[PDB]
Amino acid sequence: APSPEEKLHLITRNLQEVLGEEKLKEILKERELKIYWRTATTGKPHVAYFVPMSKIADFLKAGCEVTILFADLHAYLDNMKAPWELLELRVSYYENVIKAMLESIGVPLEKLKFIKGTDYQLSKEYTLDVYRLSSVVTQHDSKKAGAEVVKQVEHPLLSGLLYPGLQALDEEYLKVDAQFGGIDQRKIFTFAEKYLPALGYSKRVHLMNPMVPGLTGSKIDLLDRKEDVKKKLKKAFCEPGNVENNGVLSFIKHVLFPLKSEFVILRDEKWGGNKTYTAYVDLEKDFAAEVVHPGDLKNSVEVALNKLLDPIREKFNTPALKKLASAAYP
Amino acid sequence: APSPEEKLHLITRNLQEVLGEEKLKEILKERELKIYWRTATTGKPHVAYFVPMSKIADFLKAGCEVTILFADLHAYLDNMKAPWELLELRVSYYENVIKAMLESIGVPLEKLKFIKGTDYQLSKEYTLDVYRLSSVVTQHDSKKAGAEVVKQVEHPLLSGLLYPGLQALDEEYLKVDAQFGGIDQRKIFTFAEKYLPALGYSKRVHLMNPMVPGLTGSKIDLLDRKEDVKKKLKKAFCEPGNVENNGVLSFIKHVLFPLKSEFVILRDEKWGGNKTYTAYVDLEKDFAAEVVHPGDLKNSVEVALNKLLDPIREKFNTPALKKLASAAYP
């Protein structure tokens, strides 16, 4: 059972920024932290999705209650021509792939909750709060808050101005202590800290991951065959000695290293043989020194990534999920 | 029983503009017209309120179904410090004064319906439609539509951008054929004609009254004693021979003349004695010719207005309504 300090470390490791450390520590002295993470359901998740998922896994390992919101209302509003059933098929795909990813990482799911936006974002009390918020929030602040998150468009739509407030109110309605997301959500998060108190609701802790450079880029799909994973990785950019901007090193730092707090580099005996790193900074140092070659770095990632993907591919080859995957993406 | 032509005349007389004459005539060939009128519940109605009320009376006389929306949600949002019970007290005051006004005018109320905004404007289907609308309406169009109707303010609030869409959706949710209001609502009305079809809903007919100059202006309250009605009228501006901009003539044209399609001018025998006008243009002509003096015009209005107010004052002197009136305006 982790101490409050150990929980804090699991929760905050690899994050770019934490807002609300004071409250975060107060909570962890007494009880488990409750965390909300929002995901859109419009795309098709590729391996980059393991970056947020690795933090979700840390949260669960630390004993947190984690609520994942599947933003099905927004998915509908962003293309109302699409039928509610294909949209919900994609919601189901996301729910199942998230479960499979976390099972593969190896964390307890008892305190993981899935909720759909449509479950409550059209409810009476929530809607009244959306209106209350609209009566205190200036159009200027609404626009500013979504500047990095809302699609930049020809003539901006009214919906974009409403989105920051819905995401803030989610924190209250999901009854959480904190919201996690990427640092690109910072203005949405500061908006929530400013305006929730206007409605008599507490500001929340905010946990922000960095915007991590992609492993490749086509992209490696979560269900790509091992053959295609290999081929796509072979094409990945990875400059020798380059530690500042390196998608391969980033994937190790944020996804692979955290699994067991180690990473094995596969290397020919000629160049020193395999080495097991127990701190990421040690791997960074060797890569900068050019004694871990890009090809060996990529081979090491390929092996570990395929291990991570194996059980997911297995599960999605069952009749029910095989059908789901192809239907969700006809 | 009025013919379709007679109904059309009752419905459209004194209006500044009609949008949708084609559909209006089609409907009246077959059935009764259904009309929505919206009223805020934030002020305290004075005699100018008889201007819209006179059209409501015409609609009822013509056999129309009339739905009056009491905008209690907006009343709350415009001052959230105010308690829901004082707000609802004012709603009750408005409902009771409207009933008393129409009873005094003398029209059948069987097809008059009162509804509160909160009865449905927070409901699930309506809210989904608000979101759908926000996904097709540009921020630019939202702002433009409310330019004459939304309070011009320091830093404009998000709520102002939502208001035009709610008023459009009201037309669909109240299941009406037409919305009536002042010509200052024209941009809200054209917005509704443009955007309701985007959601698969029919555009409505729009009936627009002129912005009628006030009788005085303090203002004559609907419950002012006869003494104060007299005193306030004596102070009303009324330039001899001035027919273009004359609040006294406007009140005759829009409120008093329509009661029986006549108006009696009280005048000393010295100047020709009383005269009964059966067309407003005849009174206008005599006033322009300066053979109806401002003092006699005002005396004639005073007598007729006090007749209109008498039964209202009577009703509001009953214990229950006396209590309501003072509580609603503590």
Swiss-Prot record, chains A, B:
Superkingdom of origin: Eukaryota
Q: Which UniProt keywords apply?
A: Acetylation, Aminoacyl-tRNA synthetase, ATP-binding, Charcot-Marie-Tooth disease, Cytoplasm, Disease variant, Ligase, Neurodegeneration, Neuropathy, Nucleotide-binding, Nucleus, Phosphoprotein, Protein biosynthesis, RNA-binding, tRNA-binding
Q: Where is this motif: 'HIGH' region?
A: 41-49
Task: Report the residues modified as N6-acetyllysine.
Answer: K194, K203
Q: Which N-terminal residues, if any, form the signal peptide?
A: none
Briefly describe activity regulation: Resveratrol strongly inhibits the tyrosine--tRNA ligase activity.
This chain's protein is named Tyrosine--tRNA ligase, cytoplasmic
From which source organism is this entry? Homo sapiens
Q: What is the lineage of its organism?
A: Eukaryota, Metazoa, Chordata, Craniata, Vertebrata
